[PDB]
Amino acid sequence: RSSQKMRLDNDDLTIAISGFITNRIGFAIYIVLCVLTGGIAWLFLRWYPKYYVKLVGCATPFRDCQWVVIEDHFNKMTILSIRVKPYNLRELRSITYCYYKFYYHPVLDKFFCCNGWKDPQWNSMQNARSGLHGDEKAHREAVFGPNSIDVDEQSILQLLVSEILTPFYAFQVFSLILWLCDEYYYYAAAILLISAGSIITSLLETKETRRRLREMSRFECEVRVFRGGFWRTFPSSDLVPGDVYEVSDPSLTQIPADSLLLTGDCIVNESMLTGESVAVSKTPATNETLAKLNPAASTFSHDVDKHFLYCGTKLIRARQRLDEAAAVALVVRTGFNTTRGALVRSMLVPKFYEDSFRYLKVMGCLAGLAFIVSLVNFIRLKLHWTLILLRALDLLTIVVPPALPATLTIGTSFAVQRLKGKKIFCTSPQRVNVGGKIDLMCFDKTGTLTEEGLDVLGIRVASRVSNRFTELLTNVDDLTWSCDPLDPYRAALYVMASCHSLRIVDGVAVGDPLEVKMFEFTGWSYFIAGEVISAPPAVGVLRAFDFNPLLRRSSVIARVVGNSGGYALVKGSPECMPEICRPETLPSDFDELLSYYTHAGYRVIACATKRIPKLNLVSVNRMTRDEVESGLDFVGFIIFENKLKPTTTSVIKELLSSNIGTVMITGDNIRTAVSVARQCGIIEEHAHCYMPRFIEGNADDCNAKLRWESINNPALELDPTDASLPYDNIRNYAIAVTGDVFRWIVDHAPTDVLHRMLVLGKVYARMSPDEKQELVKKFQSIDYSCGFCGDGANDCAALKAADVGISLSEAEASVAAPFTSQIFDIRCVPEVIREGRASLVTSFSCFKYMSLYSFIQFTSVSFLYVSASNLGDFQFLYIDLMLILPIAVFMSWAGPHSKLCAKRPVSDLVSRKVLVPLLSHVFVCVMIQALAWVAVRQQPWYIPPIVDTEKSNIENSENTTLFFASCFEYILSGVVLNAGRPFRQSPLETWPFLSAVAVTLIATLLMLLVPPYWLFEFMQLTWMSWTFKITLIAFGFVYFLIAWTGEHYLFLWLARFLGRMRQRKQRKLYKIVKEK
Ligand code: BEF
Ligand SMILES: [Mg+2]
């Protein structure tokens, strides 16, 4: 065999592998053998390697191969090499591509994806609790390896060539060489140092930020592993499949590796990997799950899910110790194979400046014509042969300025610093300019909009005087004073505060996460719990009949200090309670209130009490459970909820103000996602909802029909044959799609169902990571640009597909986003949007200015190549150093405004609104230069330029006039082409830029009006007339006025005028279509 095609199911790649030996016996044209090119051939074949491979390697079978080459379906090429190890076949020939680790098979002569995955013959029969008896940490750790070591930025060269190395290098290097050959001492060095400093600074900054963020993601833990029948502590990075450890140990807080409980139980919280906001319980494996276990499965059935622990899931509680341990666990998948890991690896597999590429190619095309005409004129004047190339090739390096990327990078860093000054850290500087075109902002529910746990909302009390519920009573302070365990209020306070199996450790209890929050809601101090000292008596606890799967309630026998008798306090599930309680106490509104509080997403809990007169140390053990819950008295409801973060609503309001659509994408259920949306503002307060349900046939059938119904009032609907419009509070509505209906729609849709759904859909629930990324792709296909404020691994993949990615937890693997935040809130988005818009407008301003610079320079030179006399060699330097770089750099020294606006900056460079003002600025600048030149042509003397010689003489009156006019144009155009009040702070407010402009203009005025004689010789000036010296000032002033008035009024009007003359986004059509 000599080739192979894989099939990668986790991410569709279908890679192609082919093996090649190293150089031939004769390799005289190898990359370094082409030393005549040196680095040129290296550059040529670094990106496109087909010639590289055809030059070097020939086909060899995989048995004797020396390096393999990998080809995915993007037609993107890569080259890897095999490794070698001499023990268990006699050699593990293998390769590694994007963290997939492919093993050779000496028997069938093909590659395999880790031989699939292992199900050991010794493991999983009945009892794999023996442990790794002997040497099974060396003979088996070689195959599997350590736990999730990512990369150390393989070499600096890839980072340099990807993040920083712009395509402008070739012409820039040629320009530096030409200037070196043309006696440019100062400016070549200035350009080289500025570019090198900026690039090295960027590379070092990004490397250090990446290191700082990656070091925190290690999360290394310690575990008490069985080895050979002994108990030994070990680091978390020393585990292989078939190795037992223990869970009940207090020092453990996160599951090390994906596992399978064998003895005991536990309660865990899988929030981040799935999205559910409810803690889950686990149970052992009964020798039937072990046989029905294939670790290769992408997602398990319900049983094996019920017995697994997922790596990274937070451990809440375990069966406590009796010196021993009661929660052992087996290890099945370690490394990248873990479910949390597989998202990280599959994230990295898939690999505006093109406008600058267009400008570069157009400028090169124009430089061709300029070169042609310059050579024609030079050969017409038959000047010295050497001087028919150098000064006839400076045209190219002055029509394609090389100082552009440096100033763009500096302007970007002036915003990256402001971002890092607000606790927001950026790991990819390019995305800042993408922040100014966000037209949709997607969120997540658990962890970003709302806190990650359940919080008690209030207490409802079933009075005994009138069988009617009472108000919400959100605070215990009002609870204590309320009156009518004979009093139901106290019988509710006791059950909230006492009656729980909590084990306090450090003044804050640890245990089941439901009654804990209840305990802190009570606020008392904790086998007796005395009330807060700031009148409630002291409660005593005797014995607890705790939770049972069959009977959903728990009970406690308590004794008040003051009273002689005792009480039985029970807390349970309202579904089963009424058959226990005394029927003449239920307030007849039980069903309605329960249904109301359940159909909104909340969760409820019922309390009941029973007085018992005779209680002693004997009857406590004598009486069984049934007598405790024989007949009791209902008290009321304890209502949970999913609390919002305190500041989310204001941020959502401000985003809705500035005409930015918002949607919510979650993984929880829909019944609470709708209510969470309705509280904050994503859905309007009175807007209806509409859900699509299969009228007949599940997602299996391709012919199934879908009915779009309401939620609050069934039997009502909007159109299905498809209009997504109200059939037959009606102008506003929103569609909330489940997680399987969306899959069926994307599988089958008339392309109008999908589009109207995507325009109207607001609250998606039960969505999976692949569903999330397909949704983001469809969102971008209808011509959006959607940011994503995700926080967990469950939505890591989407964070890569979005245009702008934010994150809320740098600790976990959500570092995929180009951004990262250290203040966990939604208060992070408006700042990013503001900075993005300001950076966009500043980048366009600087780009237009630096592209007008070239035309100024070219016109000034071309008025002079008629007589073959350049500007000089020091006026060039003054213009290119003291005039451009200060103005161009300091024009980006500002910050964004404080408040958002409904407006939006332009985003397309080649549009008919960024280019027309530029060309008209050119057509006023050339007008004023040629005007001054004509003004000096006739009225003043000395106007003859010296006839052509071997050395192009440069002391004329056609040099000095077109040097001052050019200088004034540089300064004033730099002032005018600015970004002011609409998206930045007022220029008058910030001093650096305006003071730089003032000092430079004073310098020029001093050099013109009364020039020092030593400087009058240092440059090649010539004497002028007082009147003409005033005239130059007048020309500068009128350029200022004309440029300002045109830039604010004229050229935008002419833009629309020419657009209308030329008259002779897939969405924003559907909105009008469905306006009703
Ligand atoms: F925690 Be979220 F659902 F990504
Ligand atoms: Mg999550």
Author numbering: 204 to 291, 317 to 550, 554 to 582, 588 to 720, 746 to 787, 791 to 798, 826 to 1011, 1023 to 1030, ...
Copy out sentences from the published article reporting this entry, exactly as the authors wrote them.
P-type ATPases form a large membrane protein superfamily that couples ATP hydrolysis to the transport of cargo across biological membranes. Here we describe a series of cryo-electron microscopy structures of a yeast homolog of human ATP13A2-5, Ypk9, determined at resolutions reaching 3.4 Å, and depicting three separate transport cycle intermediates, including spermine-bound conformations. Ypk9 exhibits ten TM helices and a soluble N-terminal domain (NTD) in close proximity to the membrane, perhaps involved in lipid regulation.
Next, additional structures were determined, all in the presence of SPM, and using N- or C-terminally linked GFP protein. We exploited conditions in the presence again of BeF3− (yielding a structure at 3.7 Å resolution overall, denoted E2P*), or without a similar compound (3.5 Å, E2.PiSPM). Structural analyses to SERCA and ATP11C-CDC50A suggest the SPM-structures are indeed caught in separate E2P and E2.Pi configurations, with the E2.PiSPM structure indicating the presence of cargo is sufficient to stabilize an E2.Pi state. While the E2.Pi structures are highly similar, distinctions are identified between the two recovered E2P states (see further below). However, while we do not detect polyamine indications in the E2Pinhib structure, poor cryo-EM density for SPM, somewhat shifted toward the luminal side compared to the E2.Pi structures are available for E2P*. Based on these observations, we speculate that the affinity for SPM increases from the E2Pinhib to the E2P* and E2.Pi states. Sandwiched in-between the soluble domains, a long continuous density is observed. While poorly resolved in the E2P* data, we assign the stretch to residues D74-G97 of the Ypk9 N-terminus based on visible side chains in the E2Pinhib cryo-EM density. As observed in our E2P* structure, these shifts weaken the interactions between the N-terminal loop and the ATPase core, leading to dissociation of the auto-inhibitory stretch from the soluble A-, P-, and N-domains.
